[PDB]
Every structure is written in C-alpha cells, then in structure tokens.
Design a protein around this nucleic acid. Structure first.
Length: 1125
RNA sequence: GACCACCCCAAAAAUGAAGGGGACUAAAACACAAAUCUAUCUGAAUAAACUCUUCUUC
RNA sequence: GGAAGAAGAGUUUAUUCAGAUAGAUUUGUC
C-alpha cells in the first residue's frame, strides 16, 4: 500500500476545475510533485523474513539486511537506473559476508551492500518493477484529477435547483425522483443477474469460506473468470479502443462491435459516453452493470482481500448479497438527494460545492453537538434543584402565565417557579439552591427568585434550541452568546461576588498559608516575592516543559552532574522538613510555570545559550546547533534521539530545564529561598501564624464580610493575579450553567473548547475557559454544609432485609458509625454529590429491582479492610520506586511482584467496597445514564436535519416545506402548530392522499399505537425531550432498538448508534457485549469492568485490576433492561 | 444482525476495481499504528493546618 | 455555662498509583 497523503502534509482536496493534491492550506497543485516522489523502489522491499519458520541466527541476519536496505532506493531519472540514500550512514560497519531474495536481483544487491560499484547498467534489473510503479502513479494521478467538485446550483431564473455533474450523479438525477425508485431497483437487479449467477457465486463463497493464507489469489483468480476478464482483455479490448475513435455515439459503437460483453460495455459507456448524450430509458441501463460490479469489488476488497470469521456467509450468500447491493445503491442514491437539499441552502446560484466549503460544515456541526451535553446535564440539575413533578418537560416555563380563556377572558397558570411556594417547598429549594450556588437566597422576595430561575432556564434554552434542532445559520463561536438573557440582581451580585478581586486574592493567600509559607518565611521576605511574581490558578501546558515535580525530584543527583548552585532543605525535625519542603515546592512551583517559562521560551532566551551548556557538558560527560526557536529545536532533538534507540532523550530535556531554571533563579535574584527553613530564631516568631491565619480564613468564608486584619492586608495588597475577568453579561450567564454541570461534563466541556482553539487559530472562548478553570477548582468538592436524610439514604440499604426509614434504625444498622454519628449523618463528598444530581427515586427503583443494596456484612468488610489500607498503599508506593527509579543494585524479585500484585488487589477490593458503601457507584450510574441519554439526542439532531435535507432535495418547489422545521408558528401558513414530527406527518399524509393504493400508515388508529410504543417517528420526541426520565416506560435497550429503526435511511448512521454506546461505556470503565436478534431487539449478554494494566513494562505477566466492581457492572446491565414495572 | 462503518474517484495502452482518497461523513471536528510529554478534573492513600459533629471518663 | 481521653467528615496544601477528557511532538504505513 502506498500512502500518498498525510506524508508531507499533502492532502487531496477537490476544486472545480479538477481534483488535486494540495500541501498545507495552499492551493498550489502538488500532485505531480508528490507522485514524482514516490517513483522510487525501496530496496528492502526485495527481502523479507515473515514467519516463525526461520532460525534466529538467520532471522537476525535478515533483520539486519532489512535496516540497511531500508535507507536506499532506486529510481529512474532519465533512462538510467540510479541510487539514493535516505539518511547518513555509519561511516564504518564490518560488513563481512551477509540467497536472500528473488534470484535475478541479487548481483547488484550484494555489491550495494559492500559499496562496490555503480553498475548502472546493472541497476536495469529493477526497470520492470518501476514501469509498474510508474503506471500505478499514472492511473492514480487520474483518480485524483477526476475527483472534483461536482455539485452545482442553477437559479434557472425561476427554479433554483441543485444537481451533481459526476457521471455517477448524472445517473442519480435520472432516478432522483421517488417515482423512479422502483425502476432503479430493477435495473440493478438486471445488472446483478447478468454478472452474477447462483452456481458461480455459490462457489466463490466456498473459496472465501475456505481461506488459507495467501490462497486468496485463488479467489481473485476465480473472480476474474466470473467477470470474464480474459475475454475482454484478450478479445475485445484493442478493437474497442480504436473503434471508440471511429464513432460519436454509444449507439454507433455498438453497431461497429455488436458482441461486447455486458460488463465491458457498461464500463465503456461510463468512461466515454455516459457523460455526454441524452439519457433515454434504454441508455441508462448500460450504466448499471459497472455500478454493481464496483460494489462487489468493494466488498471483496474490504472483506476477502484485507479482513468477522464466518459472518461473511451473511453478506456473500447469493440471495443476501443481491439485497445488500440493492440497498447499498439505494443508500448511495438517497444520500445524493439529501446532498442536493443541503447545498441548495448554502449555495448561491453560481456555486459548486468545493472541498473548502464542505469541510467547514462538518467541523462546525460536530463541535456544536458536543455542547449538547452541557445543556442537557444542566436542565437535569435545574430539575433537581426544584423538585418538580412533571412527567413532561419543564423547559421554557419558569414563570406564571396568564391567559385569555375560551370563557371569561382571563386565567392564570402554574409557574414552575411559582409552584415553589404553592407546594410549600421553599425550605427544600432554598437548601437545594444553596448547594449549587453560594448566595443567601431570600425565599420571600419571590420576584427576585422568579427572575433568577428564569435566568437558568433561558440560558440553558439559548443553547438547547440551537443544537438539538438543526439550525442552518448557527456558528460555533456564538453558542455561548446567551443573546436575550438579561441578568437579574441575584445573578449579577453573585457573579460579582465570586469573581471578586479580594476573594480571588484570598484564595492565593489560602494556598500560601496551607503550604506552610507563612510559618517559615519572614514578612519582609514574602513581600519581596509578591512584588515580583504573579499567580495563576491553573498552569498551562507549554509543549515540551517537563513537570516541576519530576524536575524537583531530580535536583540532588544532577548538581553532582552540573554546578547546580542549590541546597536542599534539611533540619533537626523531619516533621518540619516535610513542611518546609512543601513551602519551597509551592513557591518555586509558582515561578517555573510562569515567570521562567515566559523568559525561557522568550526570544530574549536563556534557552539557546544554556542549551549548549547541556550539550557541552554532555560531550565532556551530537545534538544540533541550528538556532531557530526552542519548541522546534527540541522537536528536532526528539527525532535524532528516536532514530537510534539505545530514556536518554528525557534526560537532555530534563537536564536543560533544571539548569535553565536554577541559573535563572540565581541570576534573577530569587535564590534566597534555599534558606527558607533555616533559622530557628525566626520560626519561633512565626509558630502561631499558620494556625491563626487558618482560623481567620474560615471566619471570612463563613461570613465573607469580616473586617480583614491589618496583618493579612499587607499580604493581600501585594499579591498580583494577572488579569481578572472583565464582567460580561455573557460570562455571568455562562457562570450559572457551569455550576449546574456535573464533574465529567465540565471536563468534557473544557476539552471541547480547547479543541476549538487548537483546531483553528482562534482564542475565542479564551474568557469562558478562564471561568471554567476557576470554577473547576472546587466544583465537585463540598463547598457548604448540606443535609441528607436517613429515609433518603435508606433506599439503598439492607437492614434485616428491609430498607431503613428511620434515624433510629439507621443506628441499629450502623454498628461501626460510618453513616451516622448518632445525631447527624456523616457528610462524605460522595453523599454531597448524590443530593445535587441524585435522581434517587429512579435510582431507588433500578437498584431495587437489580438486587443492589448495601449490607451489614459489606459494612463490616469496609471497616475491617479500612484498618490495613495504609500498608497496602505504602507497599505499592515503595515498590513502584523500585520499578520506576531503582537503586544501583535492585531487582524486582518475583516476590516483589507478587507483593505488588497483592497490594493493588487489596486496594481494588477496598476501593470497590468503599465506593459502594459511600454511594459513588450510584453517582457513577447517574452520570452514565445522563450521558447515554444526551448522546442520543445528538442522533435526533441529524435526523431532524436529514429530513429537511431530503425535503428541499425532493421538493425544492414547495414553499411550505420549511414550515415544518420552524417553531415560530405565527409565521406558518400551513402546518401551523405542532412539533417537527407532527407537522411532517400532516405533510406526509397530504403528500399522498392520491395513491395507487392507500398509502397512509399514519392513521389515527395506527398513530395512537405509535405514540404509546415510541415507534417510528415518535421515538425522536422521547429522545430529544428526555421523556425516558423519570418513568422509563420503555427501556434504553428498546430506545436503542427504535432509534436505529428511525435512522435506517442512512446506513452509516444506523450502525453508528451501537458504537457510541459501546464507546460511552468504555469511557466509564465497562466492556459490553450485546446481541441483536433476527427480531432486531437488542439484549445484553455480558457487562464487565475494563481493566488497568499495571507495571506496564515488566517481562512478567500482565498484572491488572478491574475498573468497576461486578456489583456495579451488574447494575449497569439491569439499568439498560430496566422497564417500568 | 450493529460494536466488526460509510461515501468519492480510478478499467486501451496503466483488465493490479490485487488501486487510491475523505476535518469532504458518521464515528457528537484534524488518516490510522507505536511510543513519549504535558494541562485539567476524578478515584484511592498519607502528612500538616483549621472548622464542625459523635463518643468515653470523673 | 467542665475537663480529659477515643473517633469521624469537610476544606486547603505536598507527595504516590490509576483513570477520563484535551493539547504537543517523534516514529513509521506489505
């Protein structure tokens, strides 16, 4: 296989004139340039040792011969065989003597090995190998030329259609219409029947079925016989070409040669005549045999030739294969009319759909869907915050609605923000709101509150409405516009409150204190630091910068290596020493990421000058002297290092930074810090400081208004953070959502914007990313005190074979006191999160019917094993030292390994138990569900787009067709009311009232069946509206069953559903096996934990532990099959 | 009957449709393969600091 | 509105192992 793109940054892009290979993002045509490159013969190609069979000594001999010839090639620049070298070669190698390849070529190959002679005439051996390459490269350059933009828009002065000009597409248009679909299918079947006959096919399948390595030539050899290659080539090929010259028409050609094989005459029509003559029903038939052939060859190419073991019978049996190729050419045809719709929207009348235009749609749409997770997981929390009792969606109704009724002219409707009071839930919602947002809500002063919830709602919607329903003109950058929301007082103040200069500084102050910086540094020395260095709440990855902790770890050893100019902290007390070291690591950690990186990556750079010191010492103890910039350089260093193998790359890069950082410290006057611990005199002064500072901090966080003491302010005043976020309205509303977000949806949201920024050189989202990095700091952590109730906890407990409803029984259950201390419940982070996002009633049900509960026997194991995890962790810690960084003589005795194995195994058990006990396993499940759900909406998104695609493609004329997808029903003449589904059915029913025989399946009797079962279209409503919650009328397995039915129009989509589900489980740590029946109803056969590979590079057996407990895997299984009742 | 895709282009001589391409289209946006590095968050452990709760004993 | 001993939870910080997302480079593609 020749890889002609993605090497050299070349890509094939399509342009109106022609299709060309392009480089970078320039439009210059580099086809000839790149191909001319590949017309070389790589000399190893000549020798190989694939199998187990060879003796090692011989096998080593040949492996050797491989690497040597891998850097020499043969080309013909101008009728002369010639040689080239890829790379430098060792000046001296003892070649010695060392029937290895096909015989003819040997003479020159040995001489080449020993350097002996040009023997240019003797390079003619390889002439025939090249003219074959040259013919491949040639046929290719044409396969590139003919792949070109072929979709065009005609205004028509009236009509405004889009159509394709590919020869392929000229045949789609003919059958573009629904009416012609049945003829298009027969023509296919004619063609399949002409080429392929049951006896011969029945016998191919035997051969494919009976496959022996490289007996595949048997199948190829057989296929050519079926296709009569020998007849066409031997008999008709030359006559056809020359005669092709003699006549203009296909018709005129046929008269000249009337005994032309059917396939060889379809192939002819396609290349020469299809493009340019009127198509008649007689003419079009010619095109089909070529189309069906390609589909089989494509099947053979994909299945027999390259790659599952006996499924092949499924697609290759005569009766199946026939249907397969029919559906296929239908699927290909249906996606062409959809493409006509799509381009009809985006193209001015002149235009053609070039690769530049096409490419940006996929990228834009795809990004936008990632943001589907954000709105969905945020809605669900907004549902949690106010304990609504709507089976139905609550989007868009936080506020009371007063209407003119059919009678009496005025009436007022429930405001979900207005049930808060009607239902006497003010207390529960107050505490619920506080958990997400830190503000002292007044649940009187209702207007303030109603105006606030209406912020979270409208915020989430501004997103949801854009992504869930295809929006033609939505662009990536604007998803977080939050266009019509105007923040309310409660939101304005809180965002001002949280992103406050003082509060932010008090967070760096708190860090500094807990690092023991305030108890081991004099006030004046600190102020010198603060006037000098800035703080960032999170670091960024400059590309090549090694981790500080890795760097710090290696300080003592290197100074022996290089004149470090440092002294480690040492002291009488070990306990102080660790404390002091943290202070040193925290202060230093701060300069590196920040002040130094700026200087070191800086043009006014230490880095080039230092870098040679590392180089020079290494020579004393060969890396490049090419100037440029540090990231490219170091990159270049990577390449040299890799190519040799013989680790040493990390040291150079580690060594550059350590000496770079120190000399930086000494040079720019931070050096005093070595003596941070040092003097007992001063420390006694500072002994009460860390304690006293901590006492305040709680005081200030609890109050947030406390007068600040003078001693603290001196410090607060000289801290510098770098730029504070400007207040933005958009930022404030973005802030409201971020807090609603779950912990994984934040991490995924963040990686999504960073992808957008990396992908296109736009820093847009720069502000929004800053906020996340601030909030992501403690979003999961338990910010404030919260309360859970035993009856809520109880739901997952087996007390004497019953759930616990009572604070009093909770005592009987908890002999060991993990849940209850006897007056208040224990408040683990895990509990904290379950309250926020727990959908405990549903969770309660699923667990209940999966036999998941927590038992006393399990509690008594957790406490027993809790007593010994310190050891097992200390064990793992030290042992990993031995593996990773080992002493001069140390070995991993197998006993070391068994000891390790046992430790990690004891830890997984404790962890697995601990997670169940603490309700983390339930939190994991909660999120897995919301992800599966919200991922599914994304599918509804395509379908809702594909529909209006094929519509405008099918019926450009119909003005009304767009009405179906516009939710602004004032604006619609027809299909005035409803949802996309309902408007389409009305459209569909009218579309064929007149029918050969009654078309309509959407009868009122039938539609009623559909709506209840969530079958056909109606599944899209179940999915997009999140109706699965909270009842689970239908199963996830069922949903998947008819979501796929719903996407059966596009193959690629229909069989991507289960990939997105298998892959979403792997993220969460489950490996799933499903079975899909002849009935096509999904079931789960197994669910099991993904594994962790420990000690990845030991000659010993793979050691691993499961990611999730079998009890949990058993609970994800039932979740999927969980139906109501 | 998916996980185990899909669409486009190559047929005289170059019947090797035994070939190539695709952020172009799905996989919720940058070919896979392999190996490093890093940012962020999360789980499990330990140490120091502060805060709150529970228990036992005179 | 009494002392003195056990405990636990939360938060901050340094460190060890692991995962998930995302970013950077290298190597190579019968």
């Amino acid at each position: 296989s020749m890889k002609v793109t993605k090497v050299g940054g070349i890509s094939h892009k399509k342009y109106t004139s022609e299709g060309r290979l392009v480089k970078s993002e320039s439009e210059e045509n580099r086809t000839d340039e790149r191909l001319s490159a590949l017309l070389n013969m790589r000399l190893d190609m000549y020798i190989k040792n694939p199998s187990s069979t060879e003796t090692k000594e011989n096998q080593k001999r040949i492996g050797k011969l491989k690497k040597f010839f891998s850097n020499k090639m043969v080309y013909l620049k101008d009728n002369t065989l010639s040689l080239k070298n890829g790379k430098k070669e060792n000046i001296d190698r003892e070649y010695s003597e060392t029937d290895v390849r096909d015989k003819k070529n040997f003479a020159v190959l040995k001489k080449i090995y020993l350097n002996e002679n040009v023997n240019s005439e003797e390079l003619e051996v390889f002439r025939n190998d090249i003219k074959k390459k040259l013919n491949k490269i040639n046929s290719l350059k044409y396969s590139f030329e003919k792949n070109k933009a072929n979709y065009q828009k005609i205004n028509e002065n009236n009509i405004e259609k889009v159509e394709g000009k590919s020869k392929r597409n000229i045949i789609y248009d003919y059958y573009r219409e629904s009416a012609k679909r049945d003829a298009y299918v027969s023509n296919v079947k004619e063609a399949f029947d002409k080429l392929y006959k049951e006896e011969d096919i029945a016998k191919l399948v035997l051969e494919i079925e009976n496959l022996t390595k490289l007996e595949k030539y048997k199948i190829r050899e057989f296929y050519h016989e079926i296709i009569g290659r020998k007849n066409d080539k031997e008999n008709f090929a030359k006559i056809i070409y020359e005669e092709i010259q003699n006549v203009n028409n296909m018709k005129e050609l046929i008269e000249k040669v009337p005994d032309m094989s059917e396939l060889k005459k379809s192939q002819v029509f396609y290349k020469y005549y299809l493009d340019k003559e009127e198509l008649n029903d007689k003419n079009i038939k010619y095109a089909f045999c070529h189309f069906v052939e390609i589909e089989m060859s494509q099947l053979l190419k994909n299945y027999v030739y390259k790659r599952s073991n006996d499924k092949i019978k499924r697609i290759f049996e005569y009766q199946n294969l026939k249907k397969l190729i029919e559906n296929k050419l239908l699927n290909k045809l249906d996606t062409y009319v959809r493409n006509c719709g799509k381009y009809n929207y985006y193209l001015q009348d002149g235009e053609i759909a070039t690769s530049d235009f096409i490419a940006r749609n996929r990228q834009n749409e795809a990004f936008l869907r990632n943001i589907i997770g954000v709105s969905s997981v945020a809605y669900f929390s907004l549902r949690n915050i106010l304990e609504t009792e709507n089976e139905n969606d609550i989007t868009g109704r936080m506020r009371g609605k007063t209407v003119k009724n059919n009678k009496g002219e005025e009436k007022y409707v429930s405001g979900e923000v207005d049930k808060i009071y009607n239902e006497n839930k003010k207390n529960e919602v107050k505490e619920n709101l506080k958990m997400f947002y830190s503000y002292d809500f007044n649940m009187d002063n209702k207007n303030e509150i109603e105006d606030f919830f209406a912020n979270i709602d409208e915020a989430i919607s501004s997103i949801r409405h854009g992504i869930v329903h295809f929006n033609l003109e939505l662009e990536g950058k604007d998803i977080f516009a939050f266009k019509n929301i105007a923040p309310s007082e409660i939101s304005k103040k809180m965002f001002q409150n949280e992103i406050n200069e003082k509060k932010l500084k008090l967070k760096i102050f708190r860090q500094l204190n807990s690092a023991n910086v305030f108890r081991y540094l004099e006030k004046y020395k600190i102020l010198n630091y603060l006037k000098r260095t800035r703080f960032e709440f999170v670091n960024k990855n400059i590309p090549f910068v090694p981790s500080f902790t890795k760097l710090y770890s290696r300080i003592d050893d290197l100074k022996n290596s290089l004149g470090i100019y440092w002294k480690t902290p040492k002291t009488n007390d070990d306990n102080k020493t660790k404390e002091i070291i943290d202070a040193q690591i925290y202060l230093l950690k701060n300069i590196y990421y920040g002040e130094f990186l700026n200087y070191f990556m800086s043009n006014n750079g230490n880095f080039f000058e230092i870098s040679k010191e590392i180089i020079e010492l290494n020579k004393n103890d060969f890396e490049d002297i090419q100037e440029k910039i540090p990231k490219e350089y170091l990159a270049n260093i990577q390449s040299l290092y890799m190519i040799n193998a013989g680790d040493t790359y990390i040291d150079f890069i580690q060594k550059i930074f350590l000496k770079g950082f120190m000399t930086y410290l000494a040079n720019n006057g931070r050096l005093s810090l070595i003596y941070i611990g040092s003097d007992e005199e001063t420390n006694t002064s500072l002994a009460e400081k860390k304690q006293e500072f901590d006492k305040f901090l709680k005081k200030y966080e609890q109050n947030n208004n406390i007068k600040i003491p003078y001693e603290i302010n001196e410090f607060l005043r000289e801290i510098k953070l770098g730029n504070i976020l400007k207040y933005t309205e958009r930022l404030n509303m973005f802030y409201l959502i971020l807090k609603l977000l779950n912990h994984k949806e934040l991490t995924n949201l963040k990686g999504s914007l960073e992808k957008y920024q990396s992908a296109n050189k736009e820093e847009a989202f720069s502000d929004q990313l800053e906020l996340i990095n601030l909030l992501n700091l403690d979003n999961n952590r338990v910010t404030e005190d919260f309360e859970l109730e035993a009856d809520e906890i109880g739901k997952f407990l087996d007390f004497n074979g019953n759930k616990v409803k009572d604070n009093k029984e909770l005592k009987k259950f908890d002999t060991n006191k993990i849940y209850f201390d006897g007056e208040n419940i224990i408040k683990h982070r895990a509990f904290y999160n379950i309250k926020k996002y727990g959908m405990l009633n549903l969770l309660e049900k699923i667990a209940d019917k999966a036999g998941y509960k927590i038992s006393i026997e399990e509690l008594k194991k957790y406490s027993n094993k809790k007593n010994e995890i310190e050891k097992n962790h200390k064990m793992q810690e030290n042992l990993h030292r031995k593996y990773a960084r080992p002493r001069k003589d140390e070995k991993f005795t197998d006993e070391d390994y068994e000891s390790y194995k046992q430790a990690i195994e004891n830890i997984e058990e404790y962890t697995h138990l601990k997670n169940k006990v603490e309700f983390n396993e339930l939190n994991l499940l909660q999120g897995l569900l919301l992800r599966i759900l919200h991922r599914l909406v994304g599918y509804t998104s395509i379908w809702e787009r594909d529909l209006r695609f094929r519509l405008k493609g099918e019926f450009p004329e119909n003005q009304y067709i767009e009405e179906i997808f516009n939710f602004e029903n004032k604006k619609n003449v027809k299909y005035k009311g409803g949802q996309i589904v309902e408007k389409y059915i009305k459209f569909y029913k009218e579309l064929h009232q007149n029918d050969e025989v009654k078309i309509n399946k959407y009868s009122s009797a039938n539609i009623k069946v559909l709506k209840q079962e969530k079958k056909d279209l109606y599944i899209a409503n179940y999915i997009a509206a999140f109706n699965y919650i909270p009842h689970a009328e239908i199963s996830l397995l069922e949903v998947l069953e008819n979501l796929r039915k719903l996407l059966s129009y596009d193959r690629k989509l229909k069989n991507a559903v289960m990939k997105s589900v298998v892959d979403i489980l792997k993220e969460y740590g489950f490996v799933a096996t499903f079975k899909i029946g002849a009935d096509k109803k999904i079931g789960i056969q197994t669910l099991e934990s993904e594994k962790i590979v420990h000690l990845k590079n030991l000659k010993k057996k793979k050691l691993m532990t499961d990611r999730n407990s079998e009890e949990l895997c058993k609970l994800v299984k039932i979740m999927f099959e969980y139906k109501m009742e």
